[PDB]
Amino acid sequence: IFSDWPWRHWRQVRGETIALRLNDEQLNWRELCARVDELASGFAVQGVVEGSGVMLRAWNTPQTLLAWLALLQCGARVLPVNPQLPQPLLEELLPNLTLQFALVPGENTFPALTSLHIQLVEGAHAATWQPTRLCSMTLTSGLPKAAVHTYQAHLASAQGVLSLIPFGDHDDWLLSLPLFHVSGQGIMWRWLYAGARMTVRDKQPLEQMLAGCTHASLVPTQLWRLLVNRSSVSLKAVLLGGAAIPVELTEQAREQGIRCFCGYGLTEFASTVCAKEADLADVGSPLPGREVKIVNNEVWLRAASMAEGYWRNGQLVSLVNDEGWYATRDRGEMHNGKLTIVGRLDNLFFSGGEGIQPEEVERVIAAHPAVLQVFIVPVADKEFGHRPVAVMEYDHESVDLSEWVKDKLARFQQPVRWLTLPPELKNSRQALKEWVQRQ
Ligand SMILES: Nc1ncnc2c1ncn2[C@@H]1O[C@H](COc2cccc(CCC(=O)c3ccccc3C(=O)O)c2)[C@@H](O)[C@H]1O
Numbered sequence: 403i404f405s406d407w408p409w410r411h412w413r414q415v416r417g418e419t420i421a422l423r424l425n426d427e428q429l430n431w432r433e434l435c436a437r438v439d440e441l442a443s444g445f446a447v448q449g450v451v452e453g454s455g456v457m458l459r460a461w462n463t464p465q466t467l468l469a470w471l472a473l474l475q476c477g478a479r480v481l482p483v484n485p486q487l488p489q490p491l492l493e494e495l496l497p498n499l500t501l502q503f504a505l506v507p508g509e510n511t512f513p514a515l516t517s518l519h520i521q522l523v524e525g526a527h528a529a530t531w532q533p534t535r536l537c538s539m540t541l542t543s544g545l546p547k548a549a550v551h552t553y554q555a556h557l558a559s560a561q562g563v564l565s566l567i568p569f570g571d572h573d574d575w576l577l578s579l580p581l582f583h584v585s586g587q588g589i590m591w592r593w594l595y596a597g598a599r600m601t602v603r604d605k606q607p608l609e610q611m612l613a614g615c616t617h618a619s620l621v622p623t624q625l626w627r628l629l630v631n632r633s634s635v636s637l638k639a640v641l642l643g644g645a646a647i648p649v650e651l652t653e654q655a656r657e658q659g660i661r662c663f664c665g666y667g668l669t670e671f672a673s674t675v676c677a678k679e680a681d682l683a684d685v686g687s688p689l690p691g692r693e694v695k696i697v698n699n700e701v702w703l704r705a706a707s708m709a710e711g712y713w714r715n716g717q718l719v720s721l722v723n724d725e726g727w728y729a730t731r732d733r734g735e736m737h738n739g740k741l742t743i744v745g746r747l748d749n750l751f752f753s754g755g756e757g758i759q760p761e762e763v764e765r766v767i768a769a770h771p772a773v774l775q776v777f778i779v780p781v782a783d784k785e786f787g788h789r790p791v792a793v794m795e796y797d798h799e800s801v802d803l804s805e806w807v808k809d810k811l812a813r814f815q816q817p818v819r820w821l822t823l824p825p826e827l828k829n830s831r832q833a834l835k836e837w838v839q840r841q
Contacts, residue, residue: 403557407475407531409435412597419571423601423614424464431597434471441472442528444521448503452477452529453536455501457515459483462577462586465507465520467602470581470590473505474537477529481539481548482582491545498715499539499548533557539713540584542669548713549670549721558706559588559672560595562689566677567617567639567663574599575617578608578624585643588673589619609633619643622651625662629654643667643674646743652680666743670709670721670728676741684740694734694741695727701734701741702727733759749831751780753788756814760831763790763815772801775823779831779838783818791838792817795828 404411412421413431421431429437450456456478460466473480481499483492489511496512504510505518529535533554540549569575575593577600579585593600601615608624609631616638622645628635635658642652643665652662665677666685676694678686688694692705704727711718721728733744745761752758760778767776775795780788794800800822807816821841827833 404531404533407435407528408594408597409438409471410528410531412594416571416597419597420599421597422467422599423574423603424467425603427464437468438471438475439526439528440522440524441468441520442475443523443525445472445476445478445518446525446527447523448518448521449516450476450478450503450518454478454503455481455499455539456503456505456518457481457483457496457501457512458582459485459504459506459508461485461605462581462602463507463604464602466581467577467590467600469505469507469520475528477532477535478503479536479539479550481541482580483541484580484582487541494545495541495548499713500716536710538587538672540582540587540669540672549672549709550711550713550718551672551707551709555707555709556587556591556672557595558691559584559674560591562691562705562707563588563592563641563665563674563677564596565690566679567641569596569598569617569639571596571598573616573638574601574614575619576600576612576615577602578611578618578620584667584669584671584673585619588667591672609635612637617641621645622647625651625655625660629658635660637661639663641665641674641677642680647680649680656680666741668703668730671703671705672707672709675703675705675707678740682740684737684742687739687741694736696734696736699733699744700747701730701732701743703730704728733761751788753780753783753790753814754786756812758788758790758815760790763811766810766815767792767803767807770801770803770806772797773803777823777834778817779834781819781838786814789818790815791819791821793821793823793834793838795823 413435417432418430420428421434422429503518504515510517537553538551575589577589619641639661641663647664655662662680664680665674667674675692676685676688695702711720723729731747733747735742745759749760763778764776774797777793778790781791783789
C-alpha cells in the first residue's frame with residue numbers, strides 16, 4: 403503493497419463500497435476514513451504523536467476498533483491490553499514498555515500515563531503512511547513479553563492467510579476474537595489487506611454476532627458453544643487456532659455445513675504460521691511467506707510477519723537466533739512439507755538419562771479407545787530422577803493398560819502409577835505435577 407493508509411487506499415479504489423458494520427450501522431470507506439479522521443484529530447490535540455506509546459485497555463467494541471485506526475493513523479505504538487490482566491501484573495509490566503498514554507473507554511489508574519479520551523474534533527490528522535513504522539505491541543501469554551510488529555508484518559501475515567482462505571470484496575469477517583491478541587489483529591489486517599468488510603458489534607450471543615457475516619475466527623470452545631446450542635450458522639469459512647484442534651470438532655462442524663481451517667500461529671508471528679483446511683495430525687504446510695525447519699527436534703520459524711523484537715526495559719530486542727530464525731520451544735516433525743507439533747520442549751523431563759516428552763507418551767496411550775484423556779506427569783524418584791505417572795480420564799470405567807503399554811512404550815516411558823483425573827482439573831502442567839505430588 404500500500405502506498406497510503408489502507409483505509410485511504412480503499413477509499414480511492416472503492417470509496418462508496420461498504421467497508422464496516424459497526425453495530426448494524428454500515429460505513430463505506432470514504433465514511434470510515436472520515437470517522438477515523440475525527441478521532442485521529444482528537445488524539446493529536448491531546449498529545450499523541452508519531453511514536454507515542456499508548457495502552458489501549460479494552461474489549462472489542464465499535465469504539466475500540468475506531469480508536470485503533472485513529473491511534474495508528476497518528477503513528478502511535480499501540481499496546482492493547484486485556485482488561486482482565488490484574489493491576490499488580492500491569493504495574494510490573496507497564497514501566498518497561500515506554501508508554502505515555504492510556505485509553506480505557508473504564509478508568510486509567512496509572513498516573514505515569516496521560517488519560518486519553520475519545521474526542522471528535524475537525525481535521526484529517528494523519529502521520530505519513532510508513533509500512534516500516536511500529537504498529538503494535540502484543541503481550542505473550544512468567545511475565546508476558548511485548549512482541550512488536552510493524553504494519554508490514556501484519557500485512558505479510560494477512561497475505562499468507564488469504565492465500566489459503568479466500569476472502570474478497572463482498573465477504574465479511576466478524577471481529578470474533580480480541581484485538582489484544584494477534585487473532586483479533588489478524589482479522590482487522592485481513593479486512594484491510596483485502597479491502598473487504600468487517601463486522602464489529604457490542605457483545606451479544608455469538609450466534610447473533612455472526613449474522614450476515616461470511617468469515618470468523620474461533621477458538622475451539624467458541625465453536626463447541628455454537629454446536630451445543632444448535633445455532634444456525636451460515637459461513638464461508640471459520641479459521642480455528644490457539645491450540646490443537648480435535649478432529650471430532652471439525653467433523654461435527656463439517657456436518658453443520660461449516661468449512662473449517664485449522665491454524666498454528668504465534669503471538670510473535672502476528673497470528674497464523676501454518677494452516678490447512680480441516681482434514682490428520684499435522685498443522686498443515688507453512689503459509690506463503692513463512693518457513694519452517696526442525697533443529698534438534700525444535701520448531702524454528704522465519705517470516706515477514708515475525709515481530710521486530712520484544713520491547714525490553716525500554717528498547718527493542720531482536721527475536722532471532724544466530725541463524726536469523728525464531729526458536730519456538732515447540733517440539734516438531736516435518737513430513738511431506740507438513741508440520742506436526744509433537745509437544746512443548748518446556749514439558750520434557752528426564753527419567754534416568756532419557757528424555758520423556760509427555761505429549762508423545764500421551765498420544766500413544768490416548769489411541770486406546772477406552773481413553774478419553776491422558777496426562778503424563780513426572781514424579782520425584784531417587785534412583786532415576788523422575789518417573790512418569792499417567793493421569794487418566796476413561797470413556798466409561800477404568801481399564802488396566804499396564805500390560806497393553808509394554809509393547810508400545812519403552813520401559814522408561816511406561817507409567818509407574820495410573821491415576822484418575824480429578825474434577826478440580828477437568829473443564830495446566832504445574833497443576834497436574836502439584837496434584838500428582840499429593841497423590
Ligand atoms: N494448531 C496447533 N496445533 C498444536 N499446537 C498449537 C497449535 N496452535 C497453537 N499451538 C500451541 O500453543 C502454543 C501457542 O499458541 C498461541 C499462542 C498465542 C497466540 C496464538 C495465535 C492464535 C491465532 O492467531 C488464532 C486463534 C484463533 C483463531 C485464529 C487464529 C489465527 O488468526 O491464526 C497461538 C504454540 O506454540 C503451540 O505449542
